[PDB]
Amino acid sequence: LQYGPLAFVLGERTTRKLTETSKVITVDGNICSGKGRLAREIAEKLGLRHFPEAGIHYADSTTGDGKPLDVQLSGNCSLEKFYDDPKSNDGNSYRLQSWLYASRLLQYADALEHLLSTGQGVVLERSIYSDFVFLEAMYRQGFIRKQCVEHYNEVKKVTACEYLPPHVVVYVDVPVPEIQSRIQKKGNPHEMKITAAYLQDIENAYKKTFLPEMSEKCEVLQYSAREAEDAEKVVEDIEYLKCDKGPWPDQDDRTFHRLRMLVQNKLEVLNYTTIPVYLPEITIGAHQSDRVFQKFTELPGRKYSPGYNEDVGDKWIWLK
Amino acid sequence: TMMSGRPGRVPLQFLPNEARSLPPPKLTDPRLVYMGFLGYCSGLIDNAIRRRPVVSAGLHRQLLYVTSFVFFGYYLLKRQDYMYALRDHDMFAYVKSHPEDFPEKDKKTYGEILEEFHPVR
Amino acid sequence: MLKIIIPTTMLLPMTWMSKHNMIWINATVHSLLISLISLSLLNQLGENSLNFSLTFFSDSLSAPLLVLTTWLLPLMLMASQSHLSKETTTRKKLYITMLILLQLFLIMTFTATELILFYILFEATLVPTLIIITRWGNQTERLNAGLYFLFYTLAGSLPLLVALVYIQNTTGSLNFLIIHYWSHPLSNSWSNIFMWLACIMAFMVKMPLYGLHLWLPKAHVEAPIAGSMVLAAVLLKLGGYGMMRITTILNPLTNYMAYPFLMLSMWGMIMTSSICLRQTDLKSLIAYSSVSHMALVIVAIMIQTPWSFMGATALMIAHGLTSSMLFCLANTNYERVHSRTMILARGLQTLLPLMATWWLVASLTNLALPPSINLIGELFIITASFSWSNITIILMGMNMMITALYSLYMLITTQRGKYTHHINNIKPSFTRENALMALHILPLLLLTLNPKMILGPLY
Amino acid sequence: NVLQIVRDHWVHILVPVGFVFGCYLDRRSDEKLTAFRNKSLLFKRELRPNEEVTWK
Amino acid sequence: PHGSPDWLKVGLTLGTSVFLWIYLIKQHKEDVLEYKRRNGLE
Amino acid sequence: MNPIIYTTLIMTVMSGTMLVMISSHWLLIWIGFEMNLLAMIPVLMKNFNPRATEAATKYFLTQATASMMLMMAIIINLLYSGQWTITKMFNPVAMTMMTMALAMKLGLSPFHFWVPEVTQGISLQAGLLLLTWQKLAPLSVLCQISQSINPNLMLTMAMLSILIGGWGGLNQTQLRKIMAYSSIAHMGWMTAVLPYNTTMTILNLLIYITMTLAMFMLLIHSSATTTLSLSHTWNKMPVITSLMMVTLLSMGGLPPLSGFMPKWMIIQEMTKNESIIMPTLMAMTALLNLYFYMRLAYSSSLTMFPSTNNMKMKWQFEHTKQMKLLPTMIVLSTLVLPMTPALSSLN
Amino acid sequence: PPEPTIRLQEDPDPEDENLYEKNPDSHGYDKDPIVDLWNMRVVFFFGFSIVLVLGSTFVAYLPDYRMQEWARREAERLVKYREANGLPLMESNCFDPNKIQLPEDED
Ligand SMILES: CCCCCCCCCCCCCCCCCC(=O)OC[C@H](COP(=O)([O-])OCC(O)COP(=O)([O-])OC[C@@H](COC(=O)CCCCCCCCCCCCCCCCC)OC(=O)CCCCCCCCCCCCCCCCC)OC(=O)CCCCCCCCCCCCCCCCC
Ligand SMILES: CCCCCCCCCCCCCCCCC[C@@H](O)O[C@H](CO[C@H](O)CCCCCCCCCCCCCCC)COP(=O)(O)OCC[N+](C)(C)C
Ligand SMILES: CCCCCCCCCCCCCCCCC[C@@H](O)O[C@H](CO[C@H](O)CCCCCCCCCCCCCCC)COP(=O)(O)OCC[N+](C)(C)C
Ligand SMILES: CCCCCCCCCCCCCCCCC[C@@H](O)O[C@H](CO[C@H](O)CCCCCCCCCCCCCCC)COP(=O)(O)OCC[N+](C)(C)C
Ligand SMILES: CCCCCCCC/C=C\CCCCCCCC(=O)O[C@H](COC(=O)CCCCCCC/C=C/CCCCCCCC)COP(=O)(O)OCCN
Ligand SMILES: Nc1ncnc2c1ncn2[C@@H]1O[C@H](COP(=O)(O)OP(=O)(O)O)[C@@H](O)[C@H]1O
């Protein structure tokens, strides 16, 4: 029995599943920070579920098999090309930004669905909130135009006006010279090309436009590189604080039912990510769209519904 | 016409008892076959919308659609035939009971009827 | 009549259950077989009709049209095989489905014992043609062309439905046999005048009558080759068939009602023939030639004499075949040049001699060279019009001379002279195109041996 | 090879089946218009010793 | 997702179809016989 | 809202409509209208936002004024004859007042101004309910008293509604306003045959309800409320666009589709009563509805509009919820012309 | 003006493909030589051999349901009878005047 109005009528109430431990948590840090390690540690000590940061092919891992699809069939963008040529003429930068924002929206919806369906909390990297820091840095560096950030703002408003902000935001603070040293030690040739101005703009955006705004509706734990090495103090701070200022205490069973209906049916989650506004960086011609869609339909288990593909090996098709 | 106010008519009967005196439609009636075709088209469209193999996704579901359409069409045909029978019966009864309004026209032969001839030139 | 209708319906499941690479072969083979079955209908009697059932009948006016309709589908498939090469299997199947549905609607239209059924199918033919024009069309004006084609026809034919329901309410029947046997004269009254107009205008707009012919050049130029073939061959003859069927109840009102339309057609044949002289597009020239021929057919139907009717039937069949062949030749040139302009590709006889022979034969047949059936219809209609009035001969002769002029102009401009130097992608003509032209042209020269088969019921 | 070419060539039988079905339906519909068989004043004929209907 | 042929729903669908067909045939036979009885044919 | 409350409110709306349909006392009909109005507002305001609130208050004002006029007509009828039964109206003035009240409830011209804005304000489900179910009660009341209506006023408002719908649909890019103007035109078609035959009215109502259900369910399936948003539907679900194009052709009255049935039968019935001019004008005006249906079809399925990059994620997901009877509604609104003589069932 | 001067991501217009290049003896029906050859064979056979010939012969030998020679024989026997009996061939009135009842004018 899939969740719906009938399930809510009969037995399904998700308020009873909350055990003070749900506490959706998001960790934010500058490129090449220790946040991924820190976020993973928090999930293991609190017993929550960890969500690796959503990349280009995050949506590929949740549909069909977990294997990613071709770049032209999924994302039509690459981060390496952005690092090599941030001012590429084919508008790759804003396409990358928009695809990553949509991936983050889908991941946030999945995490909310898991939390509302099981009660077990989740831990996230950079979410739909604070995703705008890369947009701001890219605009200030001249990589994208102003119409791109207007489109991003419209999509972000229409999409994020429908979800609950995280209970606790955890920030790991690392100086720019140290993070550049970490980039040099990393060894990735494409990551070597990141300029200091880009990182400084990123950093300026996080403190200036994100920390105070989440301080007014969430709980902030600003941490440095040294004091984030030990996760015991981080966890202790996590239990010590009590959330009483956000919208979460104001929710009830009916709002939870509405949000649970919203988080499932991902087509409704991603509805406003394809609004009919035509920017050359993301708009696609009819012929290319038709060709790419026909190629996608020719993927092995993608022509029909998940349970109706004989090529994969689905049987009893004539009676499903 | 308007038969809503017709005398001795039950308020919510689909088929009155006097309708059973008429020959029922045959099971091979072309209208019944068209209703079955409609049900088959509904099944095909249902398969296509759900993104399933259109011809051979659900045989039980298509069979159910066809059977339901045939059943309802049979009953609808019965009611339609009964209504047309009532119309004809009332027509003939009224013509019988009002001879002065429907006189017998004096039969006339063309050899003694003068019709104007219009040449085509 | 169902022995033709049922196989045409079964063409659809056969097409949709065919292999991805066997749709064209199966469709062509079964369409040709259906056409062979249609040949049996030609045997006709000098008496009333071939009354198969209460729903359908056949006549020596409907039989040649049905045979032409059944014969046209394999040719349309052959023509469409080329430009739909890079199309998905589902969309090709949809195109074949549209063609089959159009054939089925035309077949049921031409038998049509009852007039409301005739109207319903005569309007049902409008949808597949519109989809073909506005979906598989190359240019951006296909949408406007489809809008024109839809709205001209619907504005013309909406009063016809009111006229038909009024006629059935008054008379009591719309079966053509009862209508013919119980016909009564129309008194010269304003209500009768407007009933005549409502009965006539729907078929006039689809002929097309001069001044109401604007939709035809747009629809013919913007349609794909199969759409142009069917529009020029069969869809134009629906108006003539309807007028021939419906002028039985319009007497004696037609004697004076016909003058505005007779004058319009007699001057419009000259106008459109002269327009053909100054045209930069092959398709537009062929469309305007079709307009001239159909205007002369309108004159024939309005004169309403036995020779007029025989000539009109013969000219309808001959024009359908000739216009289809001309459109196919133009499409063969276009698929090589991609321009659709007369003056671009020149001197093609040097590069393609057999296609030049096809061009010459098609132009000679359009020129109405004896003893082709084109001239048979032309001469019968000319004689009937001369009996109607001796002064029509001037206009008829002017039309004949201008017709020969632009036909040979179209032949000379494209086939003769010096080849264009910078055009080097003119490949040898394929066997498919040559077979298409042969199957267009041979039936004409075979029919000229038995003209009584296309002379209609008044033979 | 039978049972394999049938799966690809089964479609060919459909148009022909339609033709024979249409002929059967034409005869069946003809069967319902016998109200004047051997009753026309022009072809009013006395039956043969082994004739039940003038035409079928 | 990952589902086996739901035998309960298939069984109910087939049973409904068969029941409807049998009931329709019985209704037609009863109508024919009762029509004949009213008009005294057989 | 709570699903229990929503189900109770929907049942209350339906029970008010049934109370109007089954009662023989004027006071009970008025009570049914009041109950329907009372339970309708939260359904329209289900998704709370300023637009829905504005639409709900406009609808409430219009329906309250109509109900007051209907009550006044009932009281005048009682004054001039001590009768409560819904029958011959017994008074010329009372009949005029009642006809205007029922036209205001139905949205017939010149009382059409509220329909497009109320439809635009509310969601697609509330629009479906408002444009389908909220026509049964006033039309049934009009049918019960069809022998009392002055033909001039009924025909005038019917022709006005047809003209207004045809002209106002040409100017719209929002799909909900297009559907509202289509509803106004179809109402005008329905009420032009009440003086002559109510069976034709009911047949037209059934056909229009089926077509409108199919169209609204298709629009809900492909969640678009603007022309450009619907222009993106081909890149994900082309079958939906093709079905929508066929349904749009049916809604334009093009034979041999199902939508040709009501206009054909109404024209034939009106011609039986020696009325010729009005059916001709009505068909000429319905050409405009067909024109904007064709424009929508051009923008939707017959051409391919540009798409966006983020549709690639939508390619990977399937609709969680499937609407039952969508296939049946499409077939019924497309392929029921051969079953036309079934209308003798007094549908 | 840092705009890319590109309106949208569009595939380039493909170049037309020659059927003769990859397959001489191409017959212009299909890109696959076997399906191409069989399409040519079925088209040529079923059109020219079957329809254009057999149907033409069938139409040539259609029985006289239009009744032309029957009319010739009827006319021949009538003219033989009338010339011999002195009757003046064809008669002006199609129907005998004895059976028409004209309406008396009395003007
Ligand atoms: C006159 C009355 C007589 C004839 C009746 C006429 C209608 C008949 C059928 C009515 C509807 C029922 C079936 C339609 C279901 C739709 C499914 C579909 O799309 O087809 C895919 C499907 C094949 O594709 P697939 O591999 O399964 O998966 C592909 C996906 O489905 C999807 O593939 P995709 O998404 O990748 O491709 C996208 C494509 C796909 O989108 C579509 O094709 C949608 C389908 C069209 C809409 C249907 C509207 C509903 C009915 C309206 C009919 C209007 C008729 C009035 C005349 C006006 C004409 C408009 O859409 C586009 O390309 C966009 C552009 C659209 C082009 C212009 C649109 C024009 C549409 C108008 C169609 C009207 C005629 C329909 C004829 C049948 C067409 C299938 O086709 C079929 O196989 C089913 C066809 C019927 C099966 C027959 C099997 C029985 C034979 C064996 C027994 C022998 C019988 C005799 C017994 C005795 C012998 C022993
Ligand atoms: C635009 C491209 C072409 C489109 C198609 C054009 C074809 C349509 C033209 C219609 C044909 C003629 C219509 C009526 C012909 C009847 C003869 C009448 O007009 O002549 C005189 C009529 O006199 C005057 O003309 C009276 C009518 C005057 C008003 C008509 C308007 C004149 C111009 C309108 C043309 C507009 C056409 C396009 C409309 C959009 C005869 O005098 P009278 O003996 O007393 O009347 C005899 C008829 N009776 C017996 C029934 C009484
Ligand atoms: C789009 C085409 C229409 C589809 C309609 C919806 C299909 C699903 C409905 C399922 C069946 C509903 C019938 C209800 C069962 C019993 C009905 C019975 O009790 O009521 C009778 C009434 O029977 C119904 O009216 C008959 C409904 C049949 C509808 C089919 C006609 C459609 C027109 C032709 C199109 C062909 C459609 C075929 C495919 C469905 C008695 O009515 P009565 O109390 O005395 O007076 C009220 C009516 N008056 C006022 C007009 C006189
Ligand atoms: C290429 C180089 C030359 C090689 C060829 C040399 C040989 C030359 C022969 C070619 C033409 C020369 C003329 C010879 C004519 C003789 C044949 C003629 O006599 O037969 C005609 C017969 O021809 C047919 O009647 C006409 C052909 C049928 C046309 C139907 C078209 C086939 C269907 C295709 C689709 C239809 C598309 C168009 C729709 C209508 C007329 O016969 P008819 O005097 O009368 O009576 C027949 C005999 N009877 C008395 C026993 C009855
Ligand atoms: C390409 C566009 C062409 C569009 C068509 C143009 C011509 C349209 C034909 C006229 C429209 C009305 C048709 C009449 C329907 C038939 C019914 C009938 O004939 O009965 C007449 C009805 O006659 C009428 O009522 C006609 C009234 C006309 C009103 C509509 C006017 C539409 C435009 C008229 C002028 C244009 C006509 C020619 C157009 C030329 C081409 C553009 C008698 O009615 P009764 O009252 O029952 O009998 C009298 C004894 N008591
Ligand atoms: N808004 C964005 N725009 C472009 N690239 C981004 C954006 N957000 C994250 N990334 C890239 O995602 C990668 C992972 O993020 P990062 O935290 O820097 O490394 P790690 O996951 O190892 O800690 C990095 O290469 C980063 O550049």
Side-chain angles (χ1 to χ4, degrees), chain F residues 152-226:
Chain F
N152 295 24
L153 179 62
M154 197 87 264
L155 289 180
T156 314
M157 317 183 300
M159 186 69 201
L160 266 177
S161 283
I162 300 173
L163 279 163
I164 285 303
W167 279 327
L170 287 187
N171 213 35
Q172 306 314 316
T173 43
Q174 306 293 299
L175 301 186
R176 286 175 283 189
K177 293 179 75 175
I178 279 168
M179 294 299 291
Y181 280 108
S182 164
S183 171
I184 298 170
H186 279 101
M187 284 316 109
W189 265 93
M190 293 180 184
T191 55
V193 72
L194 288 172
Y196 309 109
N197 207 15
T198 61
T199 307
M200 298 301 109
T201 304
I202 302 156
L203 167 76
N204 193 353
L205 181 64
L206 291 195
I207 298 292
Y208 155 86
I209 277 178
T210 310
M211 287 196 285
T212 304
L213 284 189
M215 185 81 222
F216 264 101
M217 293 177 71
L218 281 165
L219 282 191
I220 285 167
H221 190 275
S222 84
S223 63
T225 68
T226 61

Side-chain angles (χ1 to χ4, degrees), chain C residues 201 204-214 260-262 264-265 291 295 298:
Chain C
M201 281 318 261
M204 283 285 177
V205 68
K206 283 190 71 174
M207 285 303 289
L209 169 75
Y210 180 72
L212 294 177
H213 71 291
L214 290 196
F261 304 95
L262 278 174
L264 272 171
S265 288
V291 177
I298 292 175

Side-chain angles (χ1 to χ4, degrees), chain A residues 29-36 53 79 82-83 96-97 100 104 126 131 133-135 138 191 194 198:
Chain A
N30 197 328
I31 304 183
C32 268
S33 294
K35 62 154 189 62
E53 191 175 5
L79 184 56
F82 164 67
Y83 282 146
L96 179 78
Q97 198 48 57
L100 280 177
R104 288 197 166 85
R126 323 205 191 79
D131 182 270
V133 305
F134 296 96
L135 185 86
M138 285 166 68
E191 293 179 353
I194 303 162
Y198 183 63

Side-chain angles (χ1 to χ4, degrees), chain A residues 148-160:
Chain A
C148 298
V149 298
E150 307 203 64
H151 167 263
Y152 187 96
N153 285 336
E154 286 183 335
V155 175
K156 186 200 180 183
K157 161 213 309 187
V158 182
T159 51

Side-chain angles (χ1 to χ4, degrees), chain C residues 225 282-283 285-286 289-290 293 319-332 358-359 361-367 406-407 410 437 440:
Chain C
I225 179 55
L282 294 174
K283 300 198 74 172
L285 197 151
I286 299 157
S289 85
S290 277
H293 291 306
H319 165 269
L321 277 175
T322 298
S323 51
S324 176
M325 199 183 175
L326 287 170
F327 271 121
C328 281
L329 292 152
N331 182 70
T332 58
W358 297 133
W359 273 103
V361 185
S363 292
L364 284 191
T365 296
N366 190 58
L367 176 140
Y406 69 86
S407 299
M410 176 194 62
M437 314 303 153
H440 275 93

